[PDB]
Amino acid sequence: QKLSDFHAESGGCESCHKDGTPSADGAFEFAQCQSCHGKLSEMDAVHKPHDGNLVCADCHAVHDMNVGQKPTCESCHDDGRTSASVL
Ligand code: HEC
Numbered sequence: 001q002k003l004s005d006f007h008a009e010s011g012g013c014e015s016c017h018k019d020g021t022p023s024a025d026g027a028f029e030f031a032q033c034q035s036c037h038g039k040l041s042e043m044d045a046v047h048k049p050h051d052g053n054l055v056c057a058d059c060h061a062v063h064d065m066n067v068g069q070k071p072t073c074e075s076c077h078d079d080g081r082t083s084a085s086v087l
Pocket residue numbers: 003004005007008012013014015016017020022026029057060061062063064
């Protein structure tokens with residue numbers, strides 16, 4: 001199941017999108033992720049370094065990734081790091 005559909009089961013499309021319609025820039029959506037999950041400054045060692053430089057959707061591609069899919073690191077880092085190497 002796509003992560004978008006997983007969420008829409010409990011919350012509808014409006015769980016993330018104002019009036020069920022995507023925003024111009026993803027701000028409203030990022031505000032919603034944080035409203036339910038908390039902020040990056042309070043998360044684990046993979047999440048916290050990105051506080052102030054990424055929104056959630058820069059790693060979690062919610063309409064493309066299935067439930068259980070972990071984002072990986074190679075699209076922005078060239079050193080071979082993984083979530084396991086950092087955690
Ligand atoms: C309920 C079934 C829906 C529908 C009809 C849409 N969404 Fe989402 N959406 C979310 C995020 C972070 C994005 C950016 C890209 C991504 O991460 O996949 C989107 C994108 C869209 C679009 C694309 C607009 C475009 O410019 O191409 C559309 C048409 C769209 N959505 C419709 C986040 C979420 C959610 C958070 C968990 C949830 C729930 C939904 N979307 C649900 C739906």
